[model samples]
Target: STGSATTTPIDSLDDAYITPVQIGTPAQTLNLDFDTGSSDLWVFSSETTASEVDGQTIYTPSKSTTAKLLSGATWSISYGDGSSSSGDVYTDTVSVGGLTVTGQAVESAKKVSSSFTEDSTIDGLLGLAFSTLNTVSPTQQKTFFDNAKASLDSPVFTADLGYHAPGTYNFGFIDTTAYTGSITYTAVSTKQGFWEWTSTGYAVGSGTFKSTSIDGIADTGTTLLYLPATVVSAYWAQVSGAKSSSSVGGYVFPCSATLPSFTFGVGSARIVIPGDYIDFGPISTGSSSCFGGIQSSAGIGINIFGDVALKAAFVVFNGATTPTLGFASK
Candidate 1:
């Protein structure tokens, strides 16, 4: 009645999460990046440029009896980080964990950017956002979860991305033991094909919570949390010697600085992100300056609650009429 899959981190790079999936009749197992920011189930394959397929594994769609080429239909994707991929389309049997869907649309990459090809471990990306955002030409294709939802007991899935460890993506069922306390849910607006919602603003440390309404997205593919620039500056303002480094491109402070806690509101619940979690990584080529994981989302339209925030809570991506986000402290 339900399907579940475990996703592991790619070394110290926690930006993208990988899940094992099987494609075709005999099942060509590939490690895919589960991305909720976009919708297109694409993978590296025999069709991909030979030079681009370095040490990574490729999916041989032709080897499967069920693999059917969709002549003119094609797909292309560009990420926020400037990485991109484009390729042809194929219909085949696809399976993840315990669920399988016959004739699911699987995009095969014929071209990939250096950013993607350079990563030898990740083979492809699986988009879990709305099917409306699918990039296939002629007609948009449905994702694995969308196609398999009809057969599932509950049209829902949960993301439990762990810290420096493995995580699970459970479909049709939510494991109650994974989180503490009750799951506080907030309604979501998917009009832009994203799990977009608004928070009642924020507060730094034990300071009073502000009433500034901030609208943002819940993205699993992204690594760091991003907020308004002024907000980030305000939080860092509390810390001594904290300043936004124009060269480093974000707010930075002494590595030994005692950081403060940041909290946001959803309904009556206060979802807090610790100061340590906000310390991203060393942003400079040769410096002790570490970027604040929470930066500005000015040009990006909406704030992004990336892995740093998601890892702090157990999230349920409820796929009802208007998708709702249920969060519980882990």
Candidate 2:
């Protein structure tokens, strides 16, 4: 079987995409961020502290007849931003789009950071990363994709992220109409528990294409594109007033600056990120300085090809025995 779902960007900044997922017997629907950076199908729930709960929807396991506690199983996860959540586990029927998994392990949050509580739009996160990264203890759990892959027509999924628009996440089958050019495939390194891959090279605006391997992970969960310091600096150099601002954090430039487009290689294919996409809105409300979507990943350890980069092309996460990643122009 195959399934398809529509994911919508929540904020003006297109911070993250959220897809509706159904969990439990009677089907409690919640908007979940389909994150490729982490592995753990965790959600806000009745088990969470009342103080931690905001306007977000909570999954009440007691309301589901099929929900069963996973005795001693527990999970905890922390993100690069320092946001974290943890809780116990329960086995329940979970559905994404039309795809259904019978005994999916659902982590119910007992505690969550203020960031999660303050952001009332996102109810939880559905990890699309490898199951190897699952945090469940005593018995690690498989992600919704890992559990549903067997029943799918094909063991593959695609992410077509949009810029300030709704995009589609297709499972089991590829939608040929979703992309423009043919896809270029690349080997994936899951050793780091991420959909990690190396870029052939990159270019700034219409400048020369630098031939150097740049390793990065494709993370839909993250909002910005983080590249090596050298690459980021090279791009900013083209803009007149662009600077690595200490006050606003990272690179920033005049809001009216005519920014240049960025292009990165995926094997022989070069995907271009439009200039306007890089002009990541104002630094503050109506501030004159704007944050650059492409920032230095020096402090981040690993380079990240987040939403800013992913929105430039169509991406495929091939989940075969020897997993691979594919990219295409859109």
Candidate 3:
């Protein structure tokens, strides 16, 4: 079944969305969003028009006492979802929590769309992923991380998504508070910006369900988990009286009460997926149900383990320190 994109709501004032993280030691805040699809920090500014913006937080440069726009650089970005934005470059001090990073680069959109202008939540996206897809990195330019890599806490940045009531996205130092042991590391493939993986099999309701071997990539940018047809069918079979449902773009499902616990086998590590993650909200006419965790896709080329997978673990993207991804328990 195909799934729609989900967005986390962010609050904004005027054209700028007030980012929780401040800039520098003086406590200057910048507008930013937690974007997984790309690794770059961007902001909409006074130069942007109302038509080019979307559901984003807007920031007025005049209001920021510490903001500094780059003199000659230009910026443009396109998303896998077909959304695009362009603007000039800017630099400023950036801060998150108690840690302050200085001389951070940012882009101020000059030609924004109505969707962006209308977005009152999330002023801009602060990409915490890898730098491969970074808009700031081109033939002539490197990303903010490229320049700031020297001063970062560990030449690595960790993104922590809060699962509790106030679920917040935390950046900077890795939170080892909940970590129990060393996490398995995966090397980043240079083919695309995606982090690839191979799964041995999946488990459902304490039952080991075997299926065709699958190779996939984990993307934090995407919201839902995607799977191949055979895997999706096998997953629904575990659901009592599983039948195809059109409610959620033609996915299979049984009653919510009969949902099963599931896990994906990544190498020797078994990542358990909770049943609640599968009990997604009603789709289509809101009558039928679909598995929240596993959804059927058009074809099986590269399966994406988006935000759903990231929520299950603490992900560390250490591009500055090493060309690897660190995964640990939250």
lDDT values of the candidates?
A: 0.86, 0.94, 0.58
Candidate 2 structure quality by residue, lDDT tens digits, 1-330:
988999999888888899999999899999999999999999999999999999999999999999999999999999988999999999999988799999999999999999999999999999999999999998899999999999999999999999889999999999999999799999999998999999999999999999899999999999999999999999999999999987878999999898999999999889999998887888888899888999999998999999999999999999999999999999
What is the TM-score of candidate 2?
A: 0.99
- Give the candidates in order of lDDT, highest first: 2, 1, 3
Could you say which candidate leads in lDDT? 2
Greater lDDT among 1 and 3 belongs to 1
In the order shown, what is each candidate's alpha-carbon RMSD?
A: 1.6, 0.8, 6.5
Q: How many steric overlaps are in each model, in order?
A: 0, 0, 29
lDDT of 1 at 151: 86
Could you tell me every candidate's TM-score relative to the true structure? Answer: 0.95, 0.99, 0.76
The parts of candidate 1 lying over 4 Å away from their true place are: 284-286
- Candidate with better lDDT, 2 vs 3: 2
| Candidate 3 residue lDDT tens string, 201-265 | 77767886574466666665555567787777777777775666565455556445557766776
Ranking by TM-score: 2, 1, 3
Candidate 2, residue 189: the lDDT equals: 96
